[PDB]
Every structure is written in C-alpha cells, then in structure tokens.
Ligand binder design. Sequence first.
Ligand SMILES: [Mg+2]
Ligand SMILES: [Mg+2]
Length: 223
Amino acid sequence: GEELFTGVVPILVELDGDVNGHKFSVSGEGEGDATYGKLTLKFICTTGKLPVPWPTLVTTFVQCFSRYPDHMKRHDFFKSAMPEGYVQERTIFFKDDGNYKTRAEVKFEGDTLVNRIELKGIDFKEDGNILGHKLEYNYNSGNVYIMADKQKNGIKVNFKIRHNIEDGSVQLADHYQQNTPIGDGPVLLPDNHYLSCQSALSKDPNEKRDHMVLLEFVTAAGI
Ligand SMILES: [Mg+2]
Ligand SMILES: [Mg+2]
C-alpha cells in the first residue's frame, strides 16, 4: 500500500454525528502528502452549526498520511492495509464530561483516500466545556502510542489530547482506539512505537458556513 502514498493524494472525509441527541454532518476535503507527513483540509458543517467545538473533532477526522522514517517502514500498519482499507474505532473520554464513540472506514475510492465516520456522543453536561462551547480553537497532543493486536490482525492505539479551556484551564480527552483491516491480505503488525503530531487550526476568511481549516504534520518515531 506504501506505493499508493508516494505523491499528493486527495482526501475526502464524511461524518454523521449525534451528541446528546444533537445530530449533524460534516464534509471535508483536502490532500495529504505522506512523504512529508503532511495534510491540509477544510471541513464544513453541512447541517448548520456544529453542536460541539471543532477542536474536539480533529482526531476523528487518516494516520496513513504519517511520515514513517525508512528505518521504521516495516511498522506502518496504516498504509499496508490499503487500498482495501481499515476500520478505525475509538472511545474518547472527556474528563469530567461525556464520551465519543466513533467508527470509521478508511479506504481508497479511486485515487482518493476516503474516511467515512459515524460518531455518537453521550453523557455530556449541558453546561460543560463541550456543549457549553468553552474550548479555545486549538489543542495540544501527546504521543500517539501504537501497538500490535495480533488477535485481530490489527493495532491498538492510545493517547491524550489536552483541550485548552477559555478560563486558562485544560480539558483532557483520553483516546482509546483499535484498527482492523477490511481486507484479508497481509498487513504490517508493528512493534511498539509512537507518532508525534502537530497541527494548526484556522478559518477561511471568506467562508460563512461553520467550518474549520486544518494543517497537520505527523511523524513516526521511537525506533
Ligand atoms: Mg492552557
Ligand atoms: Mg520486531
């Protein structure tokens, strides 16, 4: 699958979400260049206003675009599953608040890498940092720890994201994730390692719909 990633690849993201009963959808488009661990995308809420803050959705919205150094290429599960793809499931625990459960399918459609997601959020507090919209339009992430899951011919991944609250405080989002191949073909099952990421959220000055522009860089390491 690595060969599929040598140049710039278009990406499409489609998400249907329901958080405490608030339903919404988001469409995103952009491109990824795995040689540089780089992605650029613009997301738009197609049903109106997003009911949760945009930064809470970044991680849900394509780790196959991570740059794996030559010496670690044999640990790159993500690209090895393509084009058939993989299912990525998560539970994201917002400290002292609700949780998101997501299921996505990541695969190629033609020359485009597609990430289709279903998200369900429950137990959020009506006036917590999420539904109350008290988060700043940014975040800080920890290392993304990856390990093999032989039993499922996949990987297990865990990490934390620290959301910044408007009052100067922090809201932790603990991520638990599993990825399993869609195809029956061989995949790379890796030794333990981690991804290091950074991103920048911005707005399209000329855009009136609720949206987010994202620039993100990710590199594998720890080997
Ligand atoms: Mg802070
Ligand atoms: Mg080994």
